[PDB]
Amino acid sequence: SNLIEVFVDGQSVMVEPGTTVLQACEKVGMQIPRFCYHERLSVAGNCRMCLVEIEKAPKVVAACAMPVMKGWNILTNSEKTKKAREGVMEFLLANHPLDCPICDQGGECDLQDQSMMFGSDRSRFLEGKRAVEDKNIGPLVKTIMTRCIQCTRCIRFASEIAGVDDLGTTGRGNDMQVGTYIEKMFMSELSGNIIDICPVGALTSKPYAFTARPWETRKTESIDVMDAVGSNIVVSTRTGEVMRILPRMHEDINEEWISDKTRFAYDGLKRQRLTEPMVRNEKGLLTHTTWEDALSRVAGMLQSFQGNDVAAIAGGLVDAEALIALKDLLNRVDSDTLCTEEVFPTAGAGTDLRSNYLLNTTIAGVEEADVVLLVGTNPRFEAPLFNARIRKSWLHNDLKVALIGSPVDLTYRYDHLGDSPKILQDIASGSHPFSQVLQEAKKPMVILGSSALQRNDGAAILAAVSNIAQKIRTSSGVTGDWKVMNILHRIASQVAALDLGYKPGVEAIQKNPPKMLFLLGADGGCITRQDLPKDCFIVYQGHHGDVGAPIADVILPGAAYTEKSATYVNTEGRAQQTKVAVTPPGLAREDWKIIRALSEIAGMTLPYDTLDQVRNRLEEVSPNLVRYDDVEGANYFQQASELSKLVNQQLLADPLVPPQLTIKDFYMTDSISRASQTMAKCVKAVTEGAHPSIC
Amino acid sequence: TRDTQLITVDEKLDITTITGVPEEHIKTRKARIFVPARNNMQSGVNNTKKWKMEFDTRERWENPLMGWASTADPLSNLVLTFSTKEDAVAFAEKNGWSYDVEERKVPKPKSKSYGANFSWNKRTRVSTK
Amino acid sequence: KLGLREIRIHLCQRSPGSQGVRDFIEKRYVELKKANPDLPILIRECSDVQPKLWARYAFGQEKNVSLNNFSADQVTRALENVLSSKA
Amino acid sequence: DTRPTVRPRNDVAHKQLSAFGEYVAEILPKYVQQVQVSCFNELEICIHPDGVIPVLTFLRDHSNAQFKSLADLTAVDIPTRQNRFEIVYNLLSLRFNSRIRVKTYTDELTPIESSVPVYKAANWYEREIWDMFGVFFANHPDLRRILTDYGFEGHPFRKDFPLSGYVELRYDDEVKRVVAEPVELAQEFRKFDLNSPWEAFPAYRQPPE
Amino acid sequence: STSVKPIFSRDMNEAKRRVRELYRAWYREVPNTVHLFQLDISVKQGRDKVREMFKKNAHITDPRVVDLLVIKGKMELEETIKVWKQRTHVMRFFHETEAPRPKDFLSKFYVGHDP
Amino acid sequence: PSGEERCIACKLCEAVCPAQAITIEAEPRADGSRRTTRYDIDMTKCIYCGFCQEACPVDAIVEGPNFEFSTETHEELLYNKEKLLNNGDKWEAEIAANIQADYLYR
Amino acid sequence: GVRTSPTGEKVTHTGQVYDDGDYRKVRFVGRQKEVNENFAIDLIAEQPVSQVGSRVISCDGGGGALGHPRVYINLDKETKTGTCGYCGLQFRQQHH
Amino acid sequence: PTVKPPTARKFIWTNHKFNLSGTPQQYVPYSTTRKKIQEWVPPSTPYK
């Protein structure tokens, strides 16, 4: 092949041309010191901490920016390499402040560890240090810029990953300062990530300030449920308390980033919590009771109703274990009215075929597409870590992106076809010039957000967009194994519910008003007591009392995503399971156990007693639900297209308008985020602006 | 060869009855075999080179006297280190525990060019340095 | 009521033992959905799964019929034994 | 060698112990699997467990070995290995003023031959290994628990044994007795993750994957 | 792969001879244990406890694991005979101060989160 | 000397305590300072080894010269931040002098 | 200073006070609740802001090796005082 | 102290107190932290 041979301390290694000296050392297990180099940002080469000797060369080379020439012997542990790391570490620490005891980065600081692994053990600096004035860049990131080492990782990330050119270097020389120059807030959906990529404590989390130290935390690897992307996270806990949320690397989902809601909405888990069962007293007020009493009331009512009189609505954060258990319980009273708050068209194949409601191209598949079409979606806020993937392809693959919807800033320049859905018909025929771009495209990609399917013409829009994906995947010009049609979900429990057989939307409840309603975490306000028979019996099971608890007759406390081992299916059909970080607060119990307990009291005991047995049931209903971290390909797009043409609905004249036009609509979308005091500060910060940090 | 007069035993290794562990902590547990994820706050990768076996998290409550974190789980601080996944699975099955295995996640190789920072006709040109 | 409430079809996307069900879906599913517009027919495809046809009747009663190595015509006959008997 | 803060290196002893390591291997090829000398001049002989008595007897009785004192006998639990245990013998030679280490291995179910016939000192050391690790020694005069409580279940020094155990004792007034109940801690032991994510010693790096 | 040094027995027939021999030794020693230790239980209770302990390990089919159980059980008998154990140790097999934990799903559901 | 607490909740004493006798929790104070809301020493776990005062970067935690504080109950030896501050306000006149006579050996 | 909730229990400097219905108050019946009356937040606020004629000032806490690690404080910002992160002392620039 | 008086500070006790164990003025431990999890208070209005 074209591989060239280089030696790392005498060990041969075959590397592709363009590989760097730093990357060649990774191939043999050696990690070069670094402060400025990040594997996902541009190469800066300005910290000079990666200098490595090359044999038979008098000059040290920046290992992060030097391509490997053939036949080079990289000396990673010579006297010259080790004397270069001591000098650079000595210059980094000359003006650095003695803030380690009062610095939140202590214990997990790259400057500390690389000072104790590659630097000297004392200082010969006999002068006064520099002092820089702190800067305010929002309510999330605390800045102490005396600790900055001018590595420019935040500058590159803000410009490349986030597409925001707000940070930069002002001045020159020793007085070079990183900041926004003017009083400005770096409020972005990916703003919290500059905390992680900052090797020093210059950028730190403000909510997390001073609460813990790295060594005393316990790391639980779990899944984020604030959206349908399924970002992998680490839940740091200490003495039975959630302290912070961190990204967990997953190349195919979220890289090593997470959105602000995922990172900072955890503090809503500590407010407005349901800790005890409640029933309505004789005065009409909710009063604390016991599990025995609370479940007897619900079992008594459940046994007296059956058929189309017991119905349930599934919320946006429910897990697969609870969804299957509730469906089984209701099916034992001859009830099929299992509904979800999120609407999805049922015409044609409906939910029969998975490919009709999945992101069939996969998130990582956006990097091989050459044209992407977005229909009526603001992916920046609905799926912040799916918009970052688009920008990466828009930045490295020269991707062409077109949007049919409202002109919302996506952090990258796109082509605006308009806003009326009728444009979808022009593209499907040939009138619109953009129709030619899709035919010439080798690997086109069409995305229809589930927010556009909330309109009354969702059936028409889905049919129209799927029609475009049909006139592009069958006509010669596209590789056989490339999916075109895609749906971008925004609710963590949607794909799992549709896989099990839940009816999408609350339409079934509005034509058969039931006399007993289960609100399983439903806090969207889709159904209220104005749409139900008088004296209807409403049972709310959940972890927050936001909108469903105050109208419920029985409140059954449940567990949050950080308090159970639960299965969520992200927008691409990938099943992933959370892990228990802390147990539910008070008398709250695992959600699927409440239904299992209720079934036993009502005389309809479900055939599973343990989590492993409930997941065996999930394998029966849909086998893909127990294939963790695996994406199962869905096929039969042709069948969906045929069944969609049987009924011809018309598109409403109203233009497509995403529910989230600006970032102030992004910080609050569920019970947990609306109960968070950090998201409340973020909303106040992006409307009222920033109209005391020392340590 | 050996002269210890060996015998043939054909059955899966099982020592649950001789380890002395109580019954409730062999059957209700769930051991997670995984390679720890990088601490995103740092760049070092030396903590992501060995497999670990941690058990499921049980209840921690608040001590009524001093507010400390009390526990009734004897295996709440039990972390084992293994050189390979098969070594970890073998130990779990030997002690009778139920286990879930997470396959290792390795960063994918990436093409990094410093010359792309200054591109004639590409979006990789950087506006600042 | 003793009627049928749901049909679930499990099959693999590549295994030769699931070719019959795939042949059934490619040509016959569109017709069987138009004749049963209000019957949910779930088609869940995994990798390396023995084909099966689940049938959930009223009050949670479920029966499954193995479809392993079936031809495209046996699968058609298997469904008719479910959509007609209504047991 | 004039550096104040660096331990001086003795290369004369390193040479002598390496020569005696080959000497042992040449005489006992049937059991000796590996021989090594550490940078601090300590010699280790790694043997097949069937050679415990032959190897120890040679080192005790041979004229050029005369390892007549058993300084210590102990086990190490390494769960990653098939033979998780590692029986370590430290011998002292008064005649030649030298020390040697003999190492073998065994799993939970495989017996190890008792060293009492060679060293009477091994009588109590092997009870400790059985008590704290669960390694059975064949042909032992009286093999019993020596350190744990009577009726104690489990072998504490195994890596999978919890630090605080599974039982705790208190005096119960109802039965006028000291009773054992499942362990509960008013303050749980706090587990610290102290390992630095940056390699400390390149010289000990392992081949990738 | 399957060749391994035995402890005492070469097969289950040889290992079950030691198990029955151990049961006889324990069966004959309960009357003295209830006497020397002044236990407030009867011989029937003690001999039923011995039977219970043997029955717990009735599913074993490995001659090496059975040998360890007999070796461990023989050590327990030695301590009881020689009065190395005290009344507290003998009575620890009965768990007289522990409230009976629930076994069914509903009872466990009410009192906590454990399976 | 101002009366401000010396502890800035760095938790070095908590990390080095051989007996895990120290428990600390901290948050931003009303004025923004880094201060502890909990500082508990279980005087029945402590081995009186002095590591905590060797690890403190600001001489906040010290072992005083008092050795007569026997109690009639196990609870009186589970000190919290209020008990430890009172000890400081109580023995400061002596603690400050002992440090003065020894800080040039540390 | 030391406050008192409606029930009469003194509030500590960390804001801790048992509620009316909290049974844990029983531990103080026949005894006292130990509260330190020298609130640090109050005392540090009594210290005057020192005027210094330079952009950057350094604080070691007083006493040299008996203080805290020597940090440097920037006084460029004219709308607030510079505060030491260890001891809380405040500094200002002489007429800017 | 009559020759080398101690340094005076305004937070130091002016009245020394001896061992108060076993008396009404003894030290009783308690948690100095505030409640971590806030519960949900149902509305007072009876609805319906």
Ligand code: SF4
């Ligand atoms: S960034 Fe913070 S922890 Fe790291 S060396 Fe600087 S002061 Fe210390």
Ligand code: SF4
């Ligand atoms: S603030 Fe942090 S990330 Fe930005 S240049 Fe300074 S050290 Fe680098």
Ligand code: SF4
């Ligand atoms: S003196 Fe006591 S509190 Fe301080 S480190 Fe030692 S054991 Fe811990």
Ligand code: SF4
């Ligand atoms: S007492 Fe000292 S070492 Fe302990 S947390 Fe406070 S400042 Fe850190």
Ligand code: FES
């Ligand atoms: S890592 Fe190469 S110069 Fe910064």
Ligand SMILES: [K+]
């Ligand atoms: K940082």
Ligand SMILES: [Zn+2]
């Ligand atoms: Zn100061």
